[PDB]
Amino acid sequence: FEFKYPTRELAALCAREDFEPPVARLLSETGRQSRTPVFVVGIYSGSDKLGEGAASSLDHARFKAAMNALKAWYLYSPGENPRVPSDMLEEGAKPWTPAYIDMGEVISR
RNA sequence: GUUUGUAAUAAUCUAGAGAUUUUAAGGAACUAAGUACUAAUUUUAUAAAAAACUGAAUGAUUAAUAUAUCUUACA
Ligand SMILES: [Mg+2]
Numbered sequence: 001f002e003f004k005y006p007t008r009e010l011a012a013l014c015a016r017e018d019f020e021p022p023v024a025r026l027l028s029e030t031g032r033q034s035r036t037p038v039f040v041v042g043i044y045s046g047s048d049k050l051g052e053g054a055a056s057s058l059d060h061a062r063f064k065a066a067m068n069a070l071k072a073w074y075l076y077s078p079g080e081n082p083r084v085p086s087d088m089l090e091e092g093a094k095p096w097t098p099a100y101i102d103m104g105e106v107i108s109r
Numbered sequence: 110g111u112u113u114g115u116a117a118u119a120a121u122c123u124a125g126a127g128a129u130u131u132u133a134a135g136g137a138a139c140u141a142a143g144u145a146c147u148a149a150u151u152u153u154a155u156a157a158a159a160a161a162c163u164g165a166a167u168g169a170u171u172a173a174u175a176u177a178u179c180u181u182a183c184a
């Protein structure tokens with residue numbers, strides 16, 4: 001994954017799914033006014049925590065938190081060893097259950 | 110200035126080694142001041158690499174974008 005303006009893609013995702021607008025919140029911090037600080041930022045849509053990222057800058061920590069929120073959306077997995085439609089060709093197989101079909105990747109500014 | 114000490118020549122005196130006068134003379138490693146007389150004097154000698162990170166405050170300038178499609182315009 002290589003993101004470009006991940007903060008806009010996450011705002012567009014929440015808008016598409018009708019989630020509350022994403023708000024970045026400082027969960028923890030230490031070393032502000034130092035050479036290697038640690039800002040732990042978490043992006044919430046209402047009261048639910050979507051993603052979190054820890055970086056040495058406030059902006060970077062906010063971008064890293066949005067990227068991790070988008071990865072969690074794209075890297076959703078129903079299971080590690082899921083059934084494949086090719087399994088029905090092998091006779092003697094259980095009935096096929098409809099799989100999850102996504103709408104498509106978010107297109108943002 | 111300080112220091113050393115009264116040069117030579119000349120005049121006079123002297124058995125003659127010398128004396129007197131011109132003579133506070135003539136010198137001088139030194140000190141101070143003044144003076145550009147001498148030397149600081151040959152056509153871009155050498156070295157020196159040169160503005161970090163995060164937060165905060167406060168400015169300037171700017172596409173600081175994405176998706177679909179393969180034709181579009183001119184002649
Ligand atoms: Mg004297």
Ligand SMILES: [Mg+2]
Pocket residue numbers: 161
């Ligand atoms: Mg700096």
